[PDB]
Steps between C-alpha positions, in 0.01 A plus 500: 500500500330675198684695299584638156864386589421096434890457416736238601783507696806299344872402622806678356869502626704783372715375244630834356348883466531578221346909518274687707207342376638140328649216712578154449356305763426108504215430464326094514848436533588665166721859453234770325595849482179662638386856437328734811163496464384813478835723501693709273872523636738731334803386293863654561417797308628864554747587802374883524118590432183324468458157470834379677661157466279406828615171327747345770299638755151307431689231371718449831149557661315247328885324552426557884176383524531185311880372610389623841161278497564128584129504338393652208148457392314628222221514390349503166225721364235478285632677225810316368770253632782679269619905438765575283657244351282273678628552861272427774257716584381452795443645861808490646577421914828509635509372881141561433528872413389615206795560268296693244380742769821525675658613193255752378432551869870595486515769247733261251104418333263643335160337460473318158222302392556219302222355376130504469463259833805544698440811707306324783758711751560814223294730735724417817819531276333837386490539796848457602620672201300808617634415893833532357455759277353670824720473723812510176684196465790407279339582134252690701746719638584614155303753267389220267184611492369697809147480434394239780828541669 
């Protein structure tokens, strides 16, 4: 199969979510706190207007998916290995569903873009942002910015 996707898929076991878009998964047999390709999940900000503290929400999402997979894959991109504080960037699969879509599928993402590489899937989670932001979900269901939404 041809395609601008040549990634690789990758084992992780959920060792500990640690947000909405950073978990600590094993990986080769070693504990890495990975980072959701891709997404931009909301901390535990404001409790009234705006950005809300979507926080425990995509986190227990991301939570879900990955402590609820007996198989977490990944898959790393062309763009980095590492976000943040060198977390692992990487496509994300939990069960075999796309975390990073799930959660801005959700409504507890937004669609980041992390660096000049990684964005293989940034249309689809564009795309999911603007599904979400569509049909309202969680952040989407507030006034945060209700130009797209």
């Amino acid at each position: 199969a041809t395609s601008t996707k040549k990634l690789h898929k990758e084992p992780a076991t959920l060792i500990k979510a640690i947000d909405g878009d950073t978990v600590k998964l094993m990986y080769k047999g070693q504990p890495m706190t990975f980072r959701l390709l891709l997404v931009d999940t909301p901390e535990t900000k404001h409790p009234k207007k705006g950005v809300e503290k979507y926080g425990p929400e995509a986190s227990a999402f991301t939570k879900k998916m990955v402590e609820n997979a007996k198989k977490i894959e990944v898959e790393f991109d062309k763009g980095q290995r590492t976000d943040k504080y060198g977390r692992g960037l990487a496509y994300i699969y939990a069960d075999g569903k796309m975390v990073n879509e799930a959660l801005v599928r959700q409504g507890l993402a937004k669609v980041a873009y992390v660096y000049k590489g990684n964005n293989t899937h940034e249309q689809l989670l564009r795309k999911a942002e603007a599904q979400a932001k569509k049909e309202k979900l969680n952040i989407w269901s507030e006034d945060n910015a209700d130009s797209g939404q």
